[model samples]
Target: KRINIRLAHPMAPGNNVTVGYEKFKELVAEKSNGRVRIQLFGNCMLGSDRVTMEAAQRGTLEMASSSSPNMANFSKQWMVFDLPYITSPEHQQKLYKAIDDGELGKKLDEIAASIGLKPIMYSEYGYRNFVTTKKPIKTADDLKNLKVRTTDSPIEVAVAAALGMAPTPISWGETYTALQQGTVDGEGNTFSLLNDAKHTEVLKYAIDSAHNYSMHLLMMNKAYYDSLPANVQQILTEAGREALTYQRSITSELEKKAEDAFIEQGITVTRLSPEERAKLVERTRPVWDKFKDDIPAELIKLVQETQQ
Candidate 1:
């Protein structure tokens, strides 16, 4: 029987995430000799990240990709990725490799398997920045009392709060409107997303805090993945790794272009000096202590080791 696999992500059509999946689709078909088919869905057509992840765990959906912070709901160890200022953007590949091929990856794989999901590969969500419509934020003090939109992740909320802003959790779909209507003063996200979602139009300033390097996990239904023929499984695994590498390169280029796009839209871009960035990082250090019990010390150490 020809096996048909369905995969979904929240990124829009032209996004790097979607583009990477397209490459995977091509490689899979070629490697499987047309014995396997991939049905791709974008822009949350399948559902929100949480819903799709739940569906995958329930075996109702074949596969899905979601931010690593979102995976914390399934495994607390996954929260390690949400730790602020853990590594510089230039060392992202080493960070990813440490998680994918080192001790951290094994722990996460175990956690994922326990939840009925199969961890495939890591995808880049890029480093997140603080964006605002109100005023330029040059120092940590400037964010005091500023209302900032944050994801549902507690670590993110804590990071915002620690930096002196009042963190407000908002769904991804509702963020643009929230900013447009002044429900929140600002939000934190990658530059590409800021440009693509047109947040640059609604928000006027972007502080390249590079505070957090976001990651997404490409996951599959454990039952479905286990049932595949050995050769098919091999092809799927290899293709996933290759596609993620391709996605990373594309994302790096897009992030550079996104900075230009932001300026073109007349958005003020603030690049933090190493001293200023260090101050911000120090302020958010307490966030690690708050979530200490959730993340293993070994995993934390593993990540720290990669920095040196």
Candidate 2:
């Protein structure tokens, strides 16, 4: 029984998402006695998220992992996650339960299937924040017309602008050079990405905005998933969950080490006080209000109650 799975993402191999993807590749090999081969691509060698997603939708690509916000690209309801401070560290497992076994998961999968992909499991890219070129962003005003890079989506642009950035959408495939070459003054990503993608070398400050909890949604083309033999399909589901567990287990320490390295390298790391974060949250409240109509009311209540 020979089965081949092709997967792609724009994350560095060292980032938590791909580390989890790597584990799934290995786990599938072991579980299926090497008959199941996962050809994995990290670092956008295959394509950017948008490009990879289009390929996945066509079933020309077998599997892909993209950000939760990318889901907002297909379904406006996912805009809920694009809001700041929507999910926090203590909310992780509850959030996972909501996405994996609750009402929210069912709805999310339905939307995903509508676009020709089926979500298999969830892993995280960790909390995202501003990593800037000139100064540490300690408050909304700190953005100060900073040329921040963002996804091209207007929803993402609105989120960045609400925080005082003069946001621009450059291809993420080149953001590392864009930072070093001064194409943009700052960008947002998790602490691990700062180190893993070598952005720490070009960026001068790390702002702990904690604005977004970036989740990696691993998916297979619905056609491909349906075509797989029952046994192969079961192993993939099992492997994805196991890989997700391993990914989450390591990211905490990885994020800490990344922050520590930034500090050690004299990269200014600004952690906002509760009062300051509250201010930014207040500033962006309208962004949430703007997109609240499309997302199901039950989803919001489920997320809030479970995190409670």
Candidate 3:
């Protein structure tokens, strides 16, 4: 028997999310010998991340992929990934290892199980950058009086406003129009997302203010997964592991190319010197402190204790 699950996100056809999802679909179909199929809905055809999550929770959608922080409402521990520059390649590898095979992963699974969601695997979506139509923002002061569009996430709203931009929470669906109509002067997202959304067509500057890197949660309806045959579940797990490996490889290459593509299209790219980035991080450090208590103490301890 073949099962087709719809996975949705608001990325254009050329984005990394689309690339990764396509690869996952290919790998799963091959690995399953056609017993499983993943149909991807890009450009938010189904709805935004929050809507997909709620649908999955209700067992209306069999599976969905979302940024970890996008799920903060369901489990506050996910906000750990939103902390700026908190993950390096080495750090990301360590964190993924801990969550997939270590105590931290077990804890997250317990949390998910309690809430009737199944955590399949975790993968990187790339680091986010601040892209704007106004002047380049290198310091907190540069953002004063500017309107920035952020997701409905509380952390995003707080951090963007705290740094000086008058952060406005906007639906992913409305961001393009908001930027076009001057409703917002800037926004933040992975380089892939900015390119996919055609933000380069609207925004003129992209500052590599890598405030944070977010990861995706490959989640399944708990009942649907548990009801599968043992062999099917094993196949699903194997496919998920392969999906992580494939997404990480594709994402790394995609981000590099995305930068080139953006520059080729005439969008200015700003790479803040290490000192400048550090200064920005210092001013934004309070954001982490304010949200730490909102996240699981254990997840918070894991990253803080492991900081190099």
Candidate 4:
């Protein structure tokens, strides 16, 4: 009998996550000789990331992709990815490669298995930067008293607070309206997301703080994954790894395109000075202490080692 899998993510049609899933679908069908098929749902058509994650855990959903920080709720150790200034753009590929294919990957896989999920691969979501409807954030002080929309993740909330903004936890579906109606002053997100979601329509300033390097965890239902035939399993693994490369390259290209698009549309882009960027990093460093107990010290040390 042929196997059918449902893959869901919150990104829009042209977004990297959606594009990656399309590639996965194509590869799976080609490699499995029509024995396996993947159907995709984007823009949270199935549900929000939290709901989709729970559904996958229960085996009601076959697979899902969510921001790595969203996984922190399942295992706080996942918060290591949310750390500010953890890796520079020059070193991001190295850090991701080491974690995805080395000891760190094994550790994260163990954690996912414990939670009844299997991590297929880690893909780039892009580095997050701040965008605002008001003035540009040129320095750390500019963030003071700003109301920023944060995901429900504690790490995100803490990061916003550390930067002197009031962290407002809002659903991703509501962020655009929230920004347009002045419910929140700004938000932190990648260039592709900010542009694709059309936040650029309402927000005027784009600040390239590159505060956090983000990742997308492509997770499968553990029971479902284990039940697959050996050949099918191998195909899944191979396809996932290949798709990661495709996703990363496309996402990088889209980021540059989105940056240009933002400028062309008359959004004031602020590329902070090195000293100012360093100051923003310094301000948010305390968030690590606040969540220290929630994450293992060894894991934190491991991430720091990877970045170095």
TM-score per candidate: 0.95, 0.88, 0.88, 0.94
Q: State the lDDT at 15 in candidate 1.
A: 84
Off by over 4 Å in 4: none
Could you tell me which 10 consecutive residues in candidate 3 have the lowest summed lDDT? Answer: 84-93
How large an RMSD does model 4 have? 1.7
lDDT of 3 by residue, 192-305 (tens): 777766787887788777777777787888998998888778777777777777778788888888888899988888777777776667777788778777767777776655
lDDT, candidate 1, residue 115?
92
TM-score winner: 1
- Candidates sorted by TM-score, best first: 1, 4, 2, 3
In candidate 3, which residue ranges exceed 4 Å CA deviation?
A: 2-11, 39-45, 139-141, 305-307
Backbone clashes for every candidate come to 0, 0, 2, 0
Q: How accurate is candidate 4 locally (lDDT)?
A: 0.85
How would you encode candidate 4's per-residue C-alpha lDDT over 1-308 as one tens digit per residue?
A: 99999998877888887888888888899999999998888789999888888889999999998788888657777888787876678677667777768777888888899999998868788888988997677777898888999987777788888888998999877988999999999999998888887788897888888887778888999999999999988888888888888988999899999999899988888888888888888998898888788788877776777766
Tens digit of per-residue lDDT, candidate 1, span 57-162: 9999999988888887677777877899877876776877876688767777787899998887688788898989977787777778889999887888999989
Of the two candidates 3 and 4, the one with more favorable TM-score, higher being better, is 4
RMSD (CA, Å), each prediction? 1.6, 2.5, 2.5, 1.7
User: Using lDDT as the measure, what is the rank order of every candidate, best first?
Assistant: 4, 1, 2, 3
lDDT of 2: 0.81
Q: What's the CA error at residue 224 for candidate 2, in Å?
A: 2.1
**For model 1, what is the C-alpha lDDT against the true structure?**
0.85
Go through the candidates in order and give each one's C-alpha lDDT: 0.85, 0.81, 0.76, 0.85
